Amino acid sequence: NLCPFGEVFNATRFASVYAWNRKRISNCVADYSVLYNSASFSTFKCYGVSPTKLNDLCFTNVYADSFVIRGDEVRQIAPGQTGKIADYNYKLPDDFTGCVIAWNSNNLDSKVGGNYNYLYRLFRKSNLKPFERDISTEIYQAGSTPCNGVEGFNCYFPLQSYGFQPTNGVGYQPYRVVVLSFELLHAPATVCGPK
């Protein structure tokens, strides 16, 4: 009956940010002090809720979204930001109610010669709406002439590899991110703090 936060935070594999993973958390007791008292995380930051109240509140559900980005991109995981990640990969709404947690994962997600496994969406016709997810790989039309699904001149694959290398600077190193959203419905609350 303790919420399965460890499955999210301690998962062996993490998604690319364009295909960010979501886990529904419901019908459990959430002790958030396990997270906000951990020295493992460099970022723990809340919006529309105070950490002083986290263990005293009840919610219908909480959503845990996880993924990998650059360190200097962790600032984009917040309301009212723009940039490649917030525009094309993962967008938080102005009225976001939740917390963002992040930590450097250079030891796990970098590889000598460059890691081809983590990617982000480099091209898109328009910005994502908040909490929208796009995992398509349609050839992107950069010129005036259509591509007709064929990669080539002025017609680019929409995903770009981070190519994480362990020797890059800390801002360019991979970071694992978990975003907790707290949902209130006109239904009974099912995730509660220890009280």
Epitope: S33, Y36, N37, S38, A39, P51, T52, N55
Partner: nanobody
Framework: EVQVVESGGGLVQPGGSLRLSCAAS??????????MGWYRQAPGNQHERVAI???????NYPDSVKGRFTISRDNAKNTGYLQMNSLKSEDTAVYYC?????WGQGTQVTVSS
């Protein structure tokens, strides 16, 4: 019963320094067993953890304050500290601390000319 009070805050000119104190009461011989953290509030109910120290002294900080803020703990005095160097106008906020699951009301820090 456990309680924490913050102190050492106030007005400071840019580039100045402050040393905040998180003083605990009602802990017996047990203060050392809890983690302790420092947070700052921004308008819009935005709360940023600015420093964390666990029961064995492991620390961490976000990038915005790394190199400028240092958290420390005194298990004999049941007190913790946040050393804030090279303050900036953006560092203006209410700063509050926690010990385990107990929170303080906070104190104001203002960086202005």
């Amino acid at each position: 019963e456990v309680q924490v009070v913050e102190s050492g805050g106030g007005l400071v000119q840019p580039g100045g320094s402050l040393r905040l104190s998180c003083a605990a009461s009602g802990t017996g011989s047990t203060f050392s067993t809890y983690a302790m953290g420092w947070y700052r509030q921004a308008p819009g109910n935005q709360h940023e953890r600015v420093a964390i120290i666990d029961s064995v002294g492991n620390t961490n900080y976000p990038d915005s304050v790394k190199g400028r803020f240092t958290i420390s703990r005194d298990n004999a005095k049941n007190t913790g500290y946040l050393q804030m160097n090279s303050l900036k106008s953006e560092d203006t906020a209410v700063y509050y601390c926690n010990l385990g699951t107990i929170w303080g009301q906070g104190t104001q820090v203002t960086v202005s000319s």
